[PDB]
Design a protein around this ligand. Structure first.
Ligand SMILES: *[C@@H]1O[C@H](CO)[C@@H](O[C@@H]2O[C@H](CO)[C@@H](O[C@H]3O[C@H](CO[C@H]4O[C@H](CO)[C@@H](O)[C@H](O[C@H]5O[C@H](CO)[C@@H](O)[C@H](O)[C@@H]5O[C@H]5O[C@H](CO)[C@@H](O)[C@H](O)[C@@H]5O)[C@@H]4O)[C@@H](O)[C@H](O[C@H]4O[C@H](CO)[C@@H](O)[C@H](O)[C@@H]4O[C@H]4O[C@H](CO)[C@@H](O)[C@H](O)[C@@H]4O)[C@@H]3O)[C@H](O)[C@H]2NC(C)=O)[C@H](O)[C@H]1NC(C)=O
Ligand SMILES: Cn1c(-c2cc(C3COC3)on2)cnc1COc1cc(Cl)c(C#N)cc1C(C)(C)C
Ligand SMILES: [Ca+2]
Ligand SMILES: [Ca+2]
Ligand SMILES: [Cl-]
Ligand SMILES: [K+]
Ligand code: NA
Length: 804
C-alpha cells in the first residue's frame, strides 16, 4: 500500500529512492505501482516530440514541451539533442571526422571521465557488418574506437543472465541468475520475465557495478529502465543528469534498448523487418552523441556499446517433444525452449529416478536435436552447475531447435521466427563490443573476448577497486590507452622436492611386473644427465607451473618428459613434454603391454600399486606421458614408471589412447611441433575449483589412490607456425581441453564406431581456457616466457571454439 498523493514537482528521475509510503519519481516507480499521481504529467512530457525545427529556434520557454529550443536550454540542460544543429549551424557528431582523443577534454569540475554503458538486447555480432550501411553512428564508434569482431556471452545466452554478468563479472552459477526463468527449491518460488517476484533482492547475488561505485564514493545513474519510458526520454534523462552540479552528478550511466531482440524474435535475425530497428537504434546513438557534443562531453565520456547475446532462426516446427521419448511425461517439470532443465513434478516422490529419465533421453532417435546431461557432466567451459537453481538434469539443445514437454505446450501457449539461449560458443549467439573515448585506444581491433571480463575494465575506467569476480584482471589491458591496473603473477606457495635415487627395487611390493632385464659408458653418463634435467629446456618450454597451495610434491625428470608428482594424490599434478613436427609414433611392444615399473626416486609409501587396479573390476589405468611417443626403445621404459600412471575407466581409455596415439602427432604436424601439459582434475563438488583431499568421493578399490573427475591437456605452439614450438621467438598459440572421466561413452552417440568418427568431436565440445584448468588445479602456467604478463593473461583466457 502506497500514499500516492505527494508530488514529483522538482524530483523527476531523482537519484535517491524514497521509501514507502512516500510516493516515488524514479524508473522503478512504474514497476512498483508507486509513482506519485503527477509523474506522467511532470516527468513523461511528450509535447512537440523530440527534435528542434527552425521555427522553434529561440522560442519562449514552454515547460510543457518534451525538450527545448529556447536560448536558455544549454544552461538548464534540457535542449533537444539536435538544438545546436538546427539552431546554431553545428554538424551532427556522425558527420565530423574521426579525431584521436589523446587526453580527456572535460569541462571544469569533472574529476574523471564519465562512463556510459549503451546495452542493446539481441544485437548479434554479424549485424556490425551486415547492417553497416544503415548504422552510420555505430559504424563511426566502431571504426574510430576500440572494437572486437565479437564478444562471447555466458551460458545460457538469455537476457537477465548476461546483463547481470556484465554488471558483476560473475558466472550465472555465482550471481544466481541462472536463467530467464528459474525455480528456487529453498524459496519454493519461481522467477519469470512477467511478475513482481523478479524484483525481490534475494535472487540477485554478487556486487553489481552500481553498488561497487556507490561504496567507493562514485555515484551512478539507473541501470533499470521502465519499458514505457521511450528511448528519447532515457537519453534526455542521462543528458540532464550529466548537467547536475559536481557534488550531485553521477559518474556511471547505463542506457538499455529492448531492440533489436524484440523484432528478432518475430522476424528472425535477418528478416527484412530487421532493417528498421537497426536504423532506430543508430538514431538513438546519434542523439546521445549530439547531446554529449552540445554539452562539450564528446571528448570526455567513455562509451561502451555492448550486447547481451545474439539471435538464431528458430520456428515452432523445429521443436522436440519429451512426450515422444518418455512414458512418464506427467511426472516431470521442464524449463523449455533453447535449453532444457528437468526436475520432478513432486519432491514428495522417492519414486523419481533421474537415471531412468537420462537413459530414456539418450541417443534414442538418429536425428535427435538435443543431448541430456547430469549438470556435473556439462562442459566445464559453461561453468553451469554450482547453484541449487540449476536442475540436476540439463538438455543442451541444437542451434535452430527448441525442446518442449508435450505438443499442447506449444499450441496452447506459429508466433516466432527467432530465439536465443543456446551454448555460448554458437556463432549466432555471439554479440558486440565497442569502446570509444579518451581511455580506449584509437582505431584499434582487439581479439574476441568474454563478457565476464568487462566488470574489471569498467572498474578501472572509474578508478574503482573491483569486487572478487571471474574475470582475469589485466587480460583486457590491451583495450585501454591508460591502465591503472598492473597485474603480477601469484606467488608460488609450495616449492618442489628434487629426489634422487633413494630406494632399491626389493623395497617395493607393488604387485607390478615388467619385462625390463635387458642390459655401454657413452650412454651411462648420458641417461644420468636426463634424470637430472639435461633435456628439461626442450620438454618444459614455459617454466615449471607454480603450485599455489600447500602440498608436498616432487619434480621428476626424464629423457622425453618432466613431471610434478604429488605425494598426497599419488600421481602427477602435471606432466610436460614436447613433440616436434618430425617426431615418430611407435607401438607399445608386445613384451611391455602390462609393464609397470617402481620409480626408485619415490618411496613405496608414496607410490600407486598394481594390485589395487587388478582388484578394482571397474577401474583400469593409463599414462600421462604416452609410451607411443618415446624418443627411443630405451626411453620408452620411463613411460611405464608407476609415477606416470593414472586411473582410467576402460571406456575413457578409448578416448585417451586415440588422443595420445593419433591426435598429438597430428597437432604437431599441423602446428609445427606442440608442447603438451596433461594432468588430472578433481572436482567432486562441481564448483569449478581444485578439491582438497577430504572432498574426494571415489578411490581405486582398497587404496588411497583418488579417482579424477576429469583429465586436462594444454597444447601450446608458436603463433608464427614457420617457427617450431621449441624455438619460438614471438607470441604463442594454445588450445586446451577438460575431458570428463566417465565410465561410459553414452555422451557420444557414434561411440560404437571407430575412435576416428567420434573422439575428436567429444574433445572439441570440452574445449577449455587455460584459466579454467588453473582454477581446477591451483596451478599457474606460463611462468617463464619472453612475453609480457598482460599478453599471457590474454592467452590464458583464449578459448578455441571450432566454429566456422
Ligand atoms: C567466480 O568468482 C566468485 C567470486 O570470487 C567465486 O565465488 C566465491 O567462491 C568462494 C569459495 O567457494 C566463496 O567463499 C566463501 O563463501 C562464504 C561467504 O558467503 C557469503 O558472503 C559473500 C561476501 O559478501 C557473498 O558473495 C556470498 O554470496 C553467495 O551466496 C548468496 C546466498 O548466500 C547468493 O545470493 C550469491 O549468488 C552467492 O551464491 C553463490 O555462492 C555460494 C557460496 O558462497 C554457492 O553455494 C551458490 O551456489 C552460488 O554459487 C555469501 O552470501 C564463506 O562463508 C565460505 O567459508 C567456508 O570455507 C572456508 C575456506 O577458507 C572454510 O575454512 C570455512 O570452514 C568455511 O566453512 C564453514 O562453512 C562451510 C560451508 O557452508 C561448512 O561446511 C563448514 O563446516 C564451516 O562452518 C567461503 O569462504 C564466495 O562466497 C564465492 N562468492 C560468490 C559471489 O559466489 C567463484 O568461486 C569463481 N568461480 C570460479 C570457477 O573461479
Ligand atoms: C534488462 N532491463 C529491463 C527489462 C525489463 C524486462 C521485462 C519485460 O519482461 C521482462 O526485460 N528487460 C529494463 N531495464 C533493463 C536493463 O537492465 C540492465 C541493463 C544493464 Cl546495461 C545492465 C548492466 N551492466 C544490467 C541490467 C540489469 C538491471 C542487471 C538487468
Ligand atoms: Ca536479451
Ligand atoms: Ca571442487
Ligand atoms: Cl545498459
Ligand atoms: K581393474
Ligand atoms: Na555412445
Amino acid at each position: 500500500w502506497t500514499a500516492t498523493s505527494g508530488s514529483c514537482k522538482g524530483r523527476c528521475f531523482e537519484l535517491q529512492e524514497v521509501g514507502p509510503p512516500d510516493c516515488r519519481c524514479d524508473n522503478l516507480c512504474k514497476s512498483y505501482s508507486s509513482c506519485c499521481h503527477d509523474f506522467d504529467e511532470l516527468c513523461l512530457k511528450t509535447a512537440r516530440g523530440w527534435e528542434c525545427t527552425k521555427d522553434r529556434c529561440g522560442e519562449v520557454r514552454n515547460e510543457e514541451n518534451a525538450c527545448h529550443c529556447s536560448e536558455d536550454c544549454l544552461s538548464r540542460g534540457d535542449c533537444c539533442t539536435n538544438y545546436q544543429v538546427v539552431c546554431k549551424g553545428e554538424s551532427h557528431w556522425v558527420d565530423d571526422d574521426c579525431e584521436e582523443i589523446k587526453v580527456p577534454e572535460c569541462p571544469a569540475g569533472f574529476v574523471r571521465p564519465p562512463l556510459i554503458i549503451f546495452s542493446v538486447d539481441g544485437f548479434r555480432a554479424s549485424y556490425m557488418k551486415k547492417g553497416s550501411k544503415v548504422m552510420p553512428n555505430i559504424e563511426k564508434l566502431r571504426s574510430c574506437g576500440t572494437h572486437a569482431p565479437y564478444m562471447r556471452p555466458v551460458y545460457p545466452t538469455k537476457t537477465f543472465p548476461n546483463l547481470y554478468t556484465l554488471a558483476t563479472g560473475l558466472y550465472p552459477e555465482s550471481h544466481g541468475i541462472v536463467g530467464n526463468s528459474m525455480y528456487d527449491p529453498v524459496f519454493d518460488a519461481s522467477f519469470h520475465l512477467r511478475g513482481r517476484e523478479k524484483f525481490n533482492h534475494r535472487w540477485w547475488g554478487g556486487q553489481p557495478l552500481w553498488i561497487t561505485a556507490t561504496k567507493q564514493g562514485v555515484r551512478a545513474g539507473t541501470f533499470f529502465w521502465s519499458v514505457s519510458i521511450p528511448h528519447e526520454r532515457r537519453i534526455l534523462t542521462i543528458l540532464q543528469w550529466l548537467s547536475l552540479p559536481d557534488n550531485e552528478r553521477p559518474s556511471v550511466y547505463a542506457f538499455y534498448s529492448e531492440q533489436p531482440d524484440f523484432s528478432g524474435h518475430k522476424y528472425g535475425p535477418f528478416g527484412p523487418e530487421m532493417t528498421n530497428p537497426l536504423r532506430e537504434i543508430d538514431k538513438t546513438v546519434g542523439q546521445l552523441m549530439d547531446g554529449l557534443k552540445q554539452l562539450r562531453l564528446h571528448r570526455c565520456v567513455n562509451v561502451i556499446f555492448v550486447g547481451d547475446h545474439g539471435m538464431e532462426d528458430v520456428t515452432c516446427d523445429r521443436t522436440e517433444f519429451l512426450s515422444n521419448y518418455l512414458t512418464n511425461v506427467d511426472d516431470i517439470t521442464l524449463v523449455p525452449g533453447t535449453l532444457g532443465r528437468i526436475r520432478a513434478k513432486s519432491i514428495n516422490n522417492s519414486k523419481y529416478d533421474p537415471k531412468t529419465i537420462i537413459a530414456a533421453l539418450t541417443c534414442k532417435k538418429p536425428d535427435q536435436h538435443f543431448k541430456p546431461y547430469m549438470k556435473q557432466h556439462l562442459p566445464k567451459r559453461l561453468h553451469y552447475a554450482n547453484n541449487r537453481r540449476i536442475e540436476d538434469i540439463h538438455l543442451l539443445v541444437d542451434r535452430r531447435w527448441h525442446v518442449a514437454r508435450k505438443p499442447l505446450d506449444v499450441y496452447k501457449k506459429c508466433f516466432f521466427q527467432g530465439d536465443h539461449g543456446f551454448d555460448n560458443k554458437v556463432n549466432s549467439m555471439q554479440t558486440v563490443f565497442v569502446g570509444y573515448g579518451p581511455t580506449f585506444k584509437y582505431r584499434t581491433k582487439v581479439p574476441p573476448f568474454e563478457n565476464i571480463e568487462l566488470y574489471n575494465v569498467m572498474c578501472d575506467l572509474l578508478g574503482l577497486k573491483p569486487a572478487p569476480n571471474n574475470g582475469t584482471h589485466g587480460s583486457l589491458n590491451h583495450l585501454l590507452r591508460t591502465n591503472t591496473f598492473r597485474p603480477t603473477m601469484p606467488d608460488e606457495v609450495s616449492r618442489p622436492n628434487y629426489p634422487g635415487i633413494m630406494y632399491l627395487q626389493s623395497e617395493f611390493d607393488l604387485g607390478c611386473t615388467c619385462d625390463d632385464k635387458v642390459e655401454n659408458k657413452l650412454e651411462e653418463l648420458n641417461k644420468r644427465l636426463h634424470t637430472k634435467g639435461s633435456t628439461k629446456e626442450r620438454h618444459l618450454l614455459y617454466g615449471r607451473p607454480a603450485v599455489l597451495y600447500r602440498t608436498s610434491y616432487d619434480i621428476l625428470y626424464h629423457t622425453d618428459f618432466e613431471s610434478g608428482y604429488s605425494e598426497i594424490f599419488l600421481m602427477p599434478l602435471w606432466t610436460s613434454y614436447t613433440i616436434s613436427k618430425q617426431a615418430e609414433v611407435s607401438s607399445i611392444p608386445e613384451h611391455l603391454t602390462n609393464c609397470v615399473r617402481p620409480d626408485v626416486r619415490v618411496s613405496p609409501g608414496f607410490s600407486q600399486n598394481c594390485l589395487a587396479y587388478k582388484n578394482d573390476k571397474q577401474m583400469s589405468y593409463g599414462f600421462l606421458f604416452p609410451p607411443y611417443l618415446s624418443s627411443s626403445p630405451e626411453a620408452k621404459y620411463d613411460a611405464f614408471l608407476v609415477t606416470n600412471m593414472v586411473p582410467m575407466y576402460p571406456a575413457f581409455k578409448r578416448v585417451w589412447a586415440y588422443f595420445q596415439r593419433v591426435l598429438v602427432k597430428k597437432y604437431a604436424s599441423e602446428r609445427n611441433g606442440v608442447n603438451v601439459i596433461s594432468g588430472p582434475i578433481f572436482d567432486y563438488n562441481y564448483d569449478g575449483l581444485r578439491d582438497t583431499e577430504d572432498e574426494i568421493k571415489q578411490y581405486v578399490e582398497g587404496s588411497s589412490i583418488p579417482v579424477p573427475t576429469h583429465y586436462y591437456s594444454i597444447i601450446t605452439s608458436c603463433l608464427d607456425f614457420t617457427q617450431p614450438a621449441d624455438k619460438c621467438d614471438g607470441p604463442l598459440s594454445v588450445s586446451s581441453f577438460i575431458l570428463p572421466h566417465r565410465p561410459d561413452n553414452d555422451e557420444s552417440c557414434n561411440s560404437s564406431e571407430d575412435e576416428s568418427k567420434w573422439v575428436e568431436e567429444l574433445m572439441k565440445m570440452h574445449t577449455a581456457r587455460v584459466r579454467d584448468i588453473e582454477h581446477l588445479t591451483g596451478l599457474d602456467f606460463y611462468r617463464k616466457t619472453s612475453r609480457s604478463y598482460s599478453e599471457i593473461l590474454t592467452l590464458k583466457t583464449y578459448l578455441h571454439t571450432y566454429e566456422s
